[PDB]
Amino acid sequence: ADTIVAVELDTYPNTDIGDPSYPHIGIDIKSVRSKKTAKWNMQNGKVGTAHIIYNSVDKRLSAVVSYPNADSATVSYDVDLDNVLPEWVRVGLSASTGLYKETNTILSWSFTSKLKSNSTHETNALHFMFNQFSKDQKDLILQGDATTGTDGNLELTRVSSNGSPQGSSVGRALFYAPVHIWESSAVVASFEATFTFLIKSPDSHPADGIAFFISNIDSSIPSGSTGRLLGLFPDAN
Amino acid sequence: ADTIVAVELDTYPNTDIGDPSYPHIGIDIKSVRSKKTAKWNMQNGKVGTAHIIYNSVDKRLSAVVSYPNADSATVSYDVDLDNVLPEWVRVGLSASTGLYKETNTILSWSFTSKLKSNSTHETNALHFMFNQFSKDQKDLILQGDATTGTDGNLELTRVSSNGSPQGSSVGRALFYAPVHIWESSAVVASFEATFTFLIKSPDSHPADGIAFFISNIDSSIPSGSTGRLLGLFPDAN
Amino acid sequence: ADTIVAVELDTYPNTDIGDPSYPHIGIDIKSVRSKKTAKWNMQNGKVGTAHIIYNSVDKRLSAVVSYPNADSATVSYDVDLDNVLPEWVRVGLSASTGLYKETNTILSWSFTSKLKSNSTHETNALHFMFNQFSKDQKDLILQGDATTGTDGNLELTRVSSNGSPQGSSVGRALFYAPVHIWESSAVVASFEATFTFLIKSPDSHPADGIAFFISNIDSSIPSGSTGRLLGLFPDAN
Amino acid sequence: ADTIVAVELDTYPNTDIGDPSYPHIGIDIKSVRSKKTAKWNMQNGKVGTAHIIYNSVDKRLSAVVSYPNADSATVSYDVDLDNVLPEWVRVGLSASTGLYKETNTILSWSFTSKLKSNSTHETNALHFMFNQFSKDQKDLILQGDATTGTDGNLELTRVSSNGSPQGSSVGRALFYAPVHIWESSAVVASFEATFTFLIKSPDSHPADGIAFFISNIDSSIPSGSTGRLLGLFPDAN
Ligand SMILES: [Ca+2]
Ligand SMILES: [Ca+2]
Ligand SMILES: [Ca+2]
Ligand SMILES: [Ca+2]
Ligand SMILES: [Cl-]
Ligand SMILES: [Cl-]
Ligand SMILES: [Cl-]
Ligand SMILES: [Cl-]
Ligand SMILES: [Cl-]
Ligand SMILES: [Cl-]
Ligand SMILES: [Cl-]
Ligand SMILES: [Cl-]
Ligand SMILES: [Mn+2]
Ligand SMILES: [Mn+2]
Ligand SMILES: [Mn+2]
Ligand SMILES: [Mn+2]
Ligand code: NA
Ligand code: NA
Ligand code: NA
Ligand code: NA
């Protein structure tokens, strides 16, 4: 199986797998059963922004999600990712629907990783920023139902031509290049990601959510990972 | 009195004010008596690099110092700087000598502060990077004995024309513009600084050290802050 | 008198000072009579974005202005700014109204200047980015009628509480720190600026425009520089 | 055949293919016979730095090369790269030796490409920075004789364990991800690259040089491109 570290924006409460009884943001370390969660007052049909941060000195994976005119939600978990993830990874976004559904539209996505060594010329960095997505976005690996280019956006899950989200959908987008997240000479290592999203559902109960994730380089959508599994995990263990 | 948050590279052990019995790096919150320290294997005459990091989600002020071919030293302290510092600050470097002495030469200095709001256009930022210093560096406020331009460097404390550091010296350099470190709409705030330095002494016992500091905007060198007080504090309380 | 280099977004045609008979963008080198102009299909009440670019290798000052869903306008002028501007400058935004009027609202403003030397550690940089403006924006020098904080924006010229722009207004905002634009060791020097703006008028004929400008450090609004002079020049010479 | 745009640091004068009678820097558009050249006072065994710049408004490909304590060399050529290169490219470094030889050592390499659209959220960017190279640098495609990790450097051409450069060698390194260099909505597009290099030869006549290049995504070393062809071209046409 793949190795997954993720921040979930979980829109549907599956209480038998540890979700609280409301939409929430969570830190997922190798399991869909979040290590830490916080209540998320998700707004159907509104554009929100998520920020994810981590550094090797503090060893705390943190996330903040907000909408204009609203308070933020935040969640943090103390974890040494050097002990979870391999030295080289890919980074991505994932989303799913199940018997309940929503659009999982990404309007923008940025990422920066840095490794500062003890040499006088210390800094290695990777940065990418998408504020629009082309019909042929060659620097993204699209998996499952994910598509790019419709209204300049990344649609992680299936949407019909009239905007209607489809159930039982899963899709991911990964940046094309492998990312160096640990190095033997690095004295400070850090990563951050930001994405803006539009989750809209014609229903009172949207599902299932969007995640930012970091994985082994050859990661692929696990079998049967629609719905509550967010395209990230093969089961709910 | 001024309000000071600082990371000290303390080259001389003053044990009656809480210094350990060796050169060390420390986190100073409104006092020269560091809240946290770590042993620092300072290398007389070698160019080193210091990194300082903080963000408002984790509320941990951390620093790493290293030399090429050597292990790093690191120190961290949990502190909500929103409860210490004002909303607007200046940032700077400070150094001192006393009856023992050293050069306090800065070869480069960079700083980045960011405030990300809950608006869709979220980011405010300030960044500066000096890899050399002019004889007339108009975007730096020089205090005390600090000078710029000699060999393209910033000399925080007095050095003679032949390279000899002078005792009983104190000097600081602050970036000209005020820096916005907290804002009511910010959902993520962060700062980082890096500087490279050359501390050299003709003596077996160098003193007193270099600090990166954040202060009220009108901060000035306190009276009698040579030596163990690092140009930062009026006393050892 | 001050020394001014500016890119003008000129909303009102003053044909006796060389304006074409339509709104236009122009490169102004020490005179309001632009050295080069291009037609600008200004859209009353819509948010637009302007980009300004220059580097010391190509010695060409260029600007691009656009609105969503519209083609851009662009203008360029070959000029060695080393022969116009001093070594240290301030950078700013300026706007005016006269007997005709408009809002001159700035929603965001960013700037980056770089000096790369022939040393192995080559880069000096200054960068600032405002995507919102506080009621007390301490890193901006506000001149004339300019204010910050209303709806998080920078209003360069006077607007009443109900949104009504006032005539005979002039105002500027300059970044607090001096900016190093030329240095003897620099092998590549460059600057860029971007700003987003909302020019709205209740009238069919808005006036007078907005400019991004670079000036001597002590620059101030010239006397009688309302209207066609854009807050930049004391006369139309 | 591949499509190549390159900046050459040409260490050996091949006068029958248009080289001047000295080491030189050149702009190569689809041919090793540079469209523009400038004299380059190459220093055997010294670390130098090259900068390459281009933007879609000015349509001028420019390069600057320097060593510490020395004047720079610069070359520029007016060319609309939209008419040369495809929309998506890869970027890389190339070097060669022939019957004359040199080390072609890369100590650092950075690249930034930006596409700014007419949307209010305008910016797309890719940036990478290597100040060291790992024995397994997964985000680089190494071609021919190129290797990474020896002393933390990228060796484009073959070097023995004792530092001796080998003749008849060719090697390239390309960034793993495709790069978007033109887009239909982009109102400003730009790229820049910097690399630091050490060319050393035990001989009075080093050869053949190093190039920064942009190519079709599937570019590969052409047959027989050792020596004067710099790993870039299949012939001298
Ligand atoms: Ca769930
Ligand atoms: Ca001490
Ligand atoms: Ca006019
Ligand atoms: Ca040649
Ligand atoms: Cl939210
Ligand atoms: Cl529900
Ligand atoms: Cl150290
Ligand atoms: Cl001692
Ligand atoms: Cl426009
Ligand atoms: Cl008119
Ligand atoms: Cl050179
Ligand atoms: Cl020769
Ligand atoms: Mn959950
Ligand atoms: Mn101490
Ligand atoms: Mn005009
Ligand atoms: Mn040549
Ligand atoms: Na939403
Ligand atoms: Na030292
Ligand atoms: Na407008
Ligand atoms: Na060389």
UniProtKB/Swiss-Prot annotation, chains A, B, C, D:
Pfam family, one: Lectin_legB
Binding site for Ca(2+): 10, 12, 14, 19, 208
Residue numbers binding Mn(2+): 8, 10, 19, 24
A GO term for molecular function: D-mannose binding
UniProt PTM comment: The mature chain consists of residues 164-281 followed by 30-148. To form a mature chain the precursor undergoes further post-translational modification after removal of the signal sequence; cleavage after Asn at positions 148, 163, and 281 is followed by transposition and ligation (By formation of a new peptide bond) of residues 164-281 and 30-148. This maturation (circular permutation) relies on the legumain AEP1 activity and leads to an increased stability of conA after heat stress and at various pH.
UniProt keywords, alphabetically: Antiviral protein, Calcium, Glycoprotein, Lectin, Manganese, Mannose-binding, Metal-binding, Plant defense, Signal
InterPro entries, sorted: ConA-like_dom_sf, L-lectin, Lectin_LegA_CS, Lectin_legB_Mn/Ca_BS, Legume_lectin_dom, Leguminous_Lectin
Keyword Acetylation appears in the UniProt entry: no
One of the GO BP terms on file: defense response
Binding site for a carbohydrate: 99-100, 208, 228
Extra information: Binds one manganese (or another transition metal) ion and one calcium ion. The metal ions are essential for the saccharide-binding and cell-agglutinating activities.
Free-text function comment from the UniProt entry: D-mannose specific lectin. Displays antiviral activity and therefore may contribute to defense against infections.
Family recorded in the similarity comment: Belongs to the leguminous lectin family.
Assembly information from the UniProt record: Homotetramer.
Name by which UniProt lists this protein: Concanavalin-A
Organism: Canavalia ensiformis
